[PDB]
Design a protein around this ligand. Structure first.
Ligand SMILES: [Mg+2]
Ligand SMILES: [Zn+2]
Ligand SMILES: [Zn+2]
Lengths: 517, 1160
């Protein structure tokens, strides 16, 4: 209504395209560089019909839209934070315990420790790793002996779990193990999904019957042969997949032998590990989400230094994202300051490198800044400009080192810079090419080839080839006195004699003489 | 069995979307690091924007590390670093790519006027498509319950709808969401259903959007491109050399902005990839995804939304698009200040020694090593670098018959660049022939011209047979001569006539040449007396040849000797009996039409030599006493100031209307200004007394000043009138006239007051000069942009129709005839004769045969003539239909270039057009070409009927006229404002005036007729050239009117789809091939449509041509959406690609290659 009626009725056709008119007759926050092109495009060119395409098309900023979603405060207190931190540690512990439940994680760590000793106290390493192995070798025997039907035998197993929980492993280790377990489960559900896909769909066996049957042993062929011997209409199709199901069951039993665990529970421990993963990850996200403010507030100080506001607060978010990982609620120190340093270090270790087009090392950045900080006083604590010799004297570095440092400063300049302000100048337009050769130079080089190719004609074969092969022309790889002396029987001095005689010949022709210059 | 897989000859170029895999095909690696060059070694990083393994090696043949150096390994890559060691120019052509994590929207197909990705999907641009991909309002992707298919949901709406149903309508948000949206879209099935629904019981209340999108949707699907490619997943990288960082002088590198861009996009992209592996907070990752969007959009095309700054420059960064959106320097060139050279011929120019030496450097070298002298090539360089006497003679050899073409700064028309034969001159200035000094519009104020050396063999022949000045005798605009003698020479030949009585006169008779001995040997004068001599005339008739005719005529000394110069033919004596003024050129023209080129050319050199010599002999000067004031000056001024005095006294005592006494006293001074002007002219004109035999007689003043004015040579009435008469009414900055004209004159003193008044005139004179000079070219660009594609082709077609040419007669109430507007015109068909027979069918009205159109008396003043307005040609122009008017005398050579020559001639005299029921001036010319409706358009009767009022002001309304007769009515709308011209009941014809006001060309063409509208445009555009007094042929106006009526609009039912306004090119060629194909009922009847220069030029086949003038960001985009291809006939687009021009010296080339592209 308002915009549509005002625009159309006014512009008929405003003669000289009065741009500075209806743009004031438009709502919302003005002075934008977005709404501009959307009016210059309609007015002319495709007139009449373009003015009907406009209204039907009418029937913004990164940072402002970022603060919008950050607007969801959900701020915390000492109570709130510690609560989140408690859930983090809670999630983590269940994961490790779920890992400790895994016997192959202990046995692999054992296997890899023997690898370590086969090539941080070495005796201390031999100490704890001995403790683990000891509890293992005592727990392992209480398995097949079956004494204490996994009640007290279970006690030594969980004691072995605690012993494993004593170990403070490296991040790469825990991730490798956990990844390995999920890969194992991937093979497990691979076989389970294979049996299901083969028996349920290919053999027309209802999902009700498959869940009622397979859920039992899942490994022994006691369920498969009982499914075939059920004399159901979907039982006769199983014969066409007997080898497949058998092959899948045999491989799953193989996994039982690999983990040394009950297949009807590997899902259970893996389940609880996954749960903990979601729990801890969740809390850490809530953590990074909550202290999201702290990032921007401290990143505002580092603004404008060869990197935009969005980039700064982004590294501060990854800077904050790391801080939340290394922190415990069982610490007198609060999160408000501990995170701040990690964020400061995060973006400052980004402004250092990914800022200028040319590379630069951190010590360079610190040295350069120190120079400026020192120079701002020398011209103010005296009265005249800071001389390079004296300024270098006020520093540990000599002087020439400082000179070379200034040759790394600035982006530097971009070619698209106007210079003489012609119609229209650009610095990069004055830049001459030097890698190209003058057509004059190229022409002479060709005539030079002709010159030499024609001069070696007025020579003998045992002299032309000699001159040609020695200085390596028209044959790429040039040879020496020996490699030419061998192919011509007489060695060294003889061939050099001829080589000098050919040079003697070229003392009257003027062609190569003028070609010299 | 061809199928060659190399870089051979191409017949066309195609433009279309690029698949992510399409980009991968160009990829010679993947940029993965924002790193550019090393901080210390100044060496290309591993996988940065300037890799050596990816793109190309720095040095020519040596690899990065240095394991391989010389030409030994030009095909094998290095062991330590995969560096293909070939050239360094490889670094100038290699592509490369970056592969982003989450998808990114292409800024062009996103926000470029019509949202392509939106209109294709039917969805709002900066409204819905923004809030849906900036992570704000999630969108749907097809649902079989509750939710439609493309509605927009908030987080709250999303989870609510998900809780109700969910897991069966999944619909993401952001970039990849629009991807699944564009991907899921079925162009095929929608193209069917859209055709079904948008045709069912709907009038003109829907057909708009209906026809639009269905044509668009049909286009894209047939284009070949999959809408998947709209938003890219793989963004390709520009070759390093096209955006280098080259060390300037003493450090301080200089880079392009793209490095800033590419470095930002990579950094933002990698952080995105790194975050898609670490903890992924939805707010953090989504923001980084929006930042990648920012980075990519900025690199492709800044525009547009804030402009990414940085780079320390407060100025924005030059993105890719901005580097191709909106001059051609050349080798073998030079320039210098020009100077007149009287001793030259008409095909010769003075080219400086040192200038010509450095210009033909490559030719001197070759000829030197050719002859001997130089042992080798480098010997020659050292030989000419040490300008060694002998070298100059060899220079005299190479420039012998090697034409060099000259050029001046403001090149308005074809005669801006003309070829000459190089003449060595000891000097550092360039000399020019004083005849072609007018074609260039060049003066010797310090003006400087450029020179070019036709290197190519045929490029020399192009220069000799076309651009050579001797072939440009006549003006391309008007048939009259262009190299006609100017100021100095013309006063020369005027002084060679001008019969003066007695004074060493007497009628001592002889025989031509002997008189020359008489003039040098004194005794007799030269401007006497008259005197008689024997004139041996030569004339031809019927069987041509020559017929002598010796006689005894009464010429003068000047006329006798001047007769020697005159060529073999010609009427003789009578051409010299007159004088030297305008006939000075008239003589030259007639000689050309009755003789030919060469006799006319040499005649010009001779008439040039004659004028200068005898003018120098004459010695006309300008002392202060040459500009005599009339004695009645002070008398007339007092009388005028007496009259105006009486009027002011009347205004004092009421009586006369004081409101406009200003106007009437101005007439008094204006009359007063004319009185002095007439008095000064009548006095300075005749005067003199002489003393013939018995004394007492009168001729015309030999007052030098007068002689110059009575013989062209920059001397007009107004200027003279200011010299001795008075500067009349002067303008005031207000625009009003001062009521106290400058009574004094330049001969006299000028008061400080009246000069401070005249200063305004000069300021607004120069300033107005400055505007119309640039505004002239501003018009020419539009003229050419629309016309520079049509060339006279298919020889000479049939057809007889064409505008009935008749003498432009304002003589209805003012008397002003002009009947030369038919000559070199091809006849329509035997245009009658008060009796029988006479004129043939296709016979072009000769220069001598139009003079035969006076032997048929003043009776015959109407002839039908073939014009470019008509001509049933297809994509060109019939040679017959055109004419002949060139510097050449015959009809236009087949495959010329009518358009550019037409535009040039029209926009050339724009320099002498004053901008403002009469607009007048250059602006008036513009409006007629733009075909704009007047501020008060008149109205016409569409169908002939009986006039009656249609409900007196019953709407709305505003009067209503309804001319109904025979069958069916019409209701025109009169807005009360402005009266009428036909009472009720009266009958009208098909297109009668019922507003008696300004006519609209749109209505005229639409109703009156094509011949009518073209006749209107030509006769109305000429009317603004009459007043300015600039002669320009009607053909060229007709030529631009030709493709000014290029397209039309079809109204019925055919293979073409109705509402579409298509050009009569495809229309006629398709309607001719449908009457005899299957049925004429599968085709409709079309209707010519008037569109202005710009609106017409806007439409053109080549997408490359369009990207020249109009908004490249738009044209390249839309031409990309549909798989379009230029192939490849236009002039402009075939120039930027840098190949043979499909006309003139080419044409033959294009025709052969045009037919060649018929096998497949
Ligand atoms: Mg000048
Ligand atoms: Zn190498
Ligand atoms: Zn024709």
């Amino acid at each position: 209504q308002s915009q549509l009626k005002l625009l159309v009725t006014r512009g008929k056709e405003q003669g000289y395209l009065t741009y500075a008119e209806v743009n004031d007759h438009l709502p919302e926050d003005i002075v934008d560089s977005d709404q501009i092109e959307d009016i210059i495009q309609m007015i002319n060119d495709m007139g009449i019909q373009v003015m009907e395409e406009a209204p039907d098309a009418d029937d913004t900023d990164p940072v402002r839209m970022y603060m919008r979603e950050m607007g969801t405060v959900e701020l915390l207190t000492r109570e709130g934070e510690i609560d989140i931190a408690k859930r983090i540690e809670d999630g983590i512990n269940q994961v490790q315990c779920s890992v400790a439940e895994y016997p192959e994680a202990i046995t692999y760590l054992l296997e890899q420790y023997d690898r370590v000793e086969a090539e941080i106290d070495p005796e201390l390493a031999r100490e704890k790793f001995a403790e683990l192995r000891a509890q293992y070798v005592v727990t392992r025997d209480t398995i097949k002996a079956k004494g204490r039907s996994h009640a007290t035998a279970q006690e030594e197993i969980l004691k072995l779990s605690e012993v494993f929980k004593q170990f403070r492993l490296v991040p790469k280790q825990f991730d490798y193990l956990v990844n390995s377990m999920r890969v194992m489960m991937d093979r497990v559900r691979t076989q389970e999904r294979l049996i299901m896909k083969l028996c349920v769909e290919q053999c027309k066996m209802p999902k009700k019957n498959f869940i009622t049957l397979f859920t039992g042993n899942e490994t022994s062929d006691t369920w498969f042969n009982a499914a075939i011997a059920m004399n159901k209409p979907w039982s006769e199709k199983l014969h066409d997949v007997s080898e497949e199901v058998h092959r899948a069951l045999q491989k799953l039993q193989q996994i039982e032998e690999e983990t040394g665990l009950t297949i009807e529970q590997v899902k259970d421990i893996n389940r609880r590990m996954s749960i903990g993963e979601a729990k801890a990850r969740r809390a850490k996200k809530e953590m990074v989400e909550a202290n999201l403010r702290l990032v921007i507030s401290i990143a505002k100080k580092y603004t404008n230094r060869g990197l935009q506001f969005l980039d700064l607060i982004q590294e501060g978010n990854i800077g904050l994202m790391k801080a939340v990982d290394k922190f415990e609620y069982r610490r007198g120190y609060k999160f408000s300051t501990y995170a701040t340093w990690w964020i400061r270090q995060a973006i400052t270790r980004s402004i250092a490198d990914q800022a200028r087009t040319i590379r630069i090392p951190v010590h360079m950045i610190e040295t350069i800044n120190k120079l400026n900080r020192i120079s701002r006083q020398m011209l103010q604590e005296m009265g005249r400009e800071p001389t390079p010799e004296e300024l270098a004297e006020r520093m540990l570095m000599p002087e020439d080192k400082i000179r070379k440092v200034l040759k790394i400063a600035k982006e530097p300049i971009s070619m698209e810079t106007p210079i003489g302000d012609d119609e229209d100048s650009h610095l990069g337009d004055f830049i001459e090419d030097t890698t190209l050769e003058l057509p004059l130079d190229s022409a002479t080089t060709e005539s030079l080839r002709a010159a030499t190719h024609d001069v070696l004609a007025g020579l003998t074969a045992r002299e032309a080839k000699v001159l040609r092969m020695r200085f390596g022309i028209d044959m790429n790889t040039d040879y020496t006195l020996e490699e030419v002396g061998k192919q011509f029987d007489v060695t060294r001095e003889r061939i050099r004699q001829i080589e000098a005689k050919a040079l003697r010949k070229l003392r009257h022709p003027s062609r190569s003489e003028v070609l010299r210059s | 069995l061809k199928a060659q897989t190399k870089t051979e000859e191409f017949d066309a170029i195609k433009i279309a979307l690029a698949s992510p895999d399409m980009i991968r095909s160009w990829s010679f690696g993947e940029v993965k690091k924002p790193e550019t060059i090393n901080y210390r070694t100044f060496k290309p990083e591993r996988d940065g924007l300037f890799c050596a393994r990816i793109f190309g090696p720095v040095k020519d043949y040596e690899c990065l590390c240095g394991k391989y150096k010389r030409l030994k390994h030009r095909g094998v890559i290095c062991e330590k670093c995969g560096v293909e060691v070939t050239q360094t120019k490889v670094r100038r052509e290699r592509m490369g790519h970056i592969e982003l994590a989450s998808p990114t929207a292409h800024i062009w197909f996103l926000k470029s006027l019509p949202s392509r990705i939106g209109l294709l999907l039917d969805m709002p641009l900066r409204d819905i498509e923004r809030v849906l991909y900036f992570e704000s309002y999630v969108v749907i992707e097809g649902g079989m319950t509750n939710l439609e298919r493309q509605q927009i949901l908030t987080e709250e709406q999303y989870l609510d709808a998900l809780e109700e149903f969910g897991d069966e309508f999944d619909a993401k948000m952001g970039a990849e969401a629009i991807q699944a949206l564009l991907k899921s879209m079925d162009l095929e099935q929608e193209c069917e259903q859209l055709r079904e629904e948008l045709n069912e019981t709907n009038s003109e209340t829907k057909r708009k959007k209906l026809t639009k999108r269905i044509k668009l949707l049909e286009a894209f699907v047939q284009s070949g491109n999959k809408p998947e490619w709209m938003i890219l997943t793989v963004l390709p990288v520009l070759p390093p050399d096209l955006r280098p960082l080259v060390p300037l002088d003493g450090g301080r590198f200089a880079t392009s902005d793209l490095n800033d861009l590419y470095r930002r996009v990579i950094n933002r992209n990698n952080r995105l990839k790194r975050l898609l592996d670490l903890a992924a907070p939805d707010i953090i990752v989504r923001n980084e995804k929006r930042m990648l969007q920012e980075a990519v959009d900025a690199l492709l095309d800044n525009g547009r939304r804030g402009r990414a700054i940085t780079g320390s420059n407060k100025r924005p960064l030059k993105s890719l698009a901005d580097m191709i959106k909106g001059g051609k320097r050349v080798d073998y060139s030079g320039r210098s200040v020009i100077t007149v050279g009287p001793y030259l011929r008409l095909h010769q120019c003075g080219l400086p020694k040192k200038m010509a030496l450095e210009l033909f450097k490559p030719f001197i070298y070759g000829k030197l090593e050719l002859r001997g002298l130089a042992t080798t090539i480098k010997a020659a360089k050292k030989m000419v670098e040490r300008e060694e006497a002998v070298v100059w003679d060899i220079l005299d050899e190479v420039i012998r018959e090697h034409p060099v073409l000259l050029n001046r700064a403001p090149t308005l028309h074809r005669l801006g660049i003309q070829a000459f034969e190089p003449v060595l001159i000891e000097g550092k200035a360039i000399q020019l022939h004083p005849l072609v000094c007018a074609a260039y519009n060049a003066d010797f104020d310090g003006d400087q011209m450029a020179v070019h050396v036709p290197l190519t063999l045929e490029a020399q022949l192009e220069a000799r047979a076309l651009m050579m000045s001797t072939n440009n005798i006549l003006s391309p605009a008007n048939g009259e001569p262009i190299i006609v003698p100017s100021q100095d020479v013309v006063l020369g030949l005027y002084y060679m006539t001008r019969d003066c009585v007695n004074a060493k006169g007497e009628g001592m008779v002889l025989t031509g040449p002997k008189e020359a001995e008489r003039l040098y040997r004194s005794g007799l004068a030269s401007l006497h007396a008259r005197v008689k001599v024997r004139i041996t005339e030569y004339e031809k008739d019927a069987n041509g040849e020559l017929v002598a005719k010796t006689s005894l005529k009464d010429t003068t000394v000047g006329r006798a000797i001047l007769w020697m110069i005159v060529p073999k033919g010609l009427p003789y004596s009578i051409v010299n009996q007159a004088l030297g003024k305008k006939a000075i050129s008239k003589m030259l023209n007639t000689c050309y039409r009755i003789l030919g080129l060469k006799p006319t050319v040499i005649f010009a050199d001779q008439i040039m030599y004659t004028g200068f010599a005898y003018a120098a002999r004459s010695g006309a000067s300008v002392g202060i006493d040459d500009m005599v004031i009339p004695e009645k000056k002070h008398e007339i001024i007092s009388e005028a100031e007496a009259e105006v005095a009486e009027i002011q006294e009347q205004f004092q005592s009421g009586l006369v209307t004081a409101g406009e006494r200003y106007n009437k006293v101005i007439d008094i001074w204006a009359a007063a200004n004319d009185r002095v002007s007439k008095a000064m002219m009548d006095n300075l004109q005749t005067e003199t007394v002489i003393n013939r035999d018995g004394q007492e007689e009168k001729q015309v003043s030999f007052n030098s000043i007068y002689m110059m004015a009575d013989s062209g040579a920059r001397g007009s009435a107004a200027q003279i009138r200011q010299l001795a008469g008075m500067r009349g009414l002067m303008a005031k900055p207000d625009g009003s006239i001062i009521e106290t004209p400058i009574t004094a004159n330049f001969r006299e003193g000028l008061n400080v007051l009246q000069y401070f008044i005249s200063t305004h005139g000069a300021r607004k004179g120069l300033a107005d000069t400055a505007l119309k000079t640039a505004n002239s070219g501003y018009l020419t660009r539009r003229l050419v942009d629309v016309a520079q594609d049509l060339v006279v082709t298919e020889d000479d077609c049939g057809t007889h129709e064409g505008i009935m040419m008749t003498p432009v007669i304002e003589g209805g109430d003012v008397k002003e005839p002009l009947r030369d507007r038919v000559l070199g015109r091809v006849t329509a068909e035997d245009v009658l004769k008060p009796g029988t027979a006479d004129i043939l069918v296709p016979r072009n009205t000769l220069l001598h045969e139009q003079w035969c159109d006076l032997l048929e008396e003043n009776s015959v003043d109407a002839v039908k003539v073939r014009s470019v307005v008509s001509c049933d040609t297809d994509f060109g122009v019939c040679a017959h239909c055109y004419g002949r008017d060139l510097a050449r005398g015959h009809i236009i050579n087949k495959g010329e270039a009518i358009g550019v020559i037409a535009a040039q001639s029209i926009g050339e005299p724009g320099t002498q057009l004053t901008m403002r029921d009469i607009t007048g001036g250059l602006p008036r010319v513009a409006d007629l070409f733009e075909a704009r409706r007047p501020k008060e358009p008149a109205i016409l009767a569409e169908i002939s009927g009986i006039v009656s009022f249609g409900k007196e002001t019953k709407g709305k309304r505003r009067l209503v006229i309804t001319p109904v007769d025979g069958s069916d009515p019409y209701e025109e709308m009169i807005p009360k404002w402005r009266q009428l011209n036909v009472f009720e009941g009266e009958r009208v014809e098909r297109g009668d005036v019922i507003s008696d006001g300004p006519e609209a060309p749109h209505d005229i063409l639409r109703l009156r007729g094509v011949h009518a509208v073209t006749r209107y445009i030509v006769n109305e555009v000429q009317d603004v050239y009459r007043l300015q007094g600039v002669k320009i042929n009607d053909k060229h106006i007709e030529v631009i009117v030709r493709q000014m009526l290029r397209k039309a609009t079809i109204v019925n039912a055919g293979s073409s789809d109705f509402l579409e306004g298509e050009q009569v090119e495809y229309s006629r060629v398709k309607i001719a091939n449908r009457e005899l194909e299957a049925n004429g009922k599968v085709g409709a009847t079309y209707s010519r449509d008037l569109l202005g220069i710009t609106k017409a030029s806007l439409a053109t086949e080549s997408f490359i041509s369009a990207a020249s003038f109009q908004e490249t960001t738009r044209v390249l985009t839309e031409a990309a959406v549909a798989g379009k291809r230029d192939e490849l006939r236009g002039l402009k687009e075939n120039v930027i690609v840098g190949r043979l021009i499909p006309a003139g010296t080419g044409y033959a080339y294009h025709q052969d290659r045009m037919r060649r592209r018929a096998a497949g």
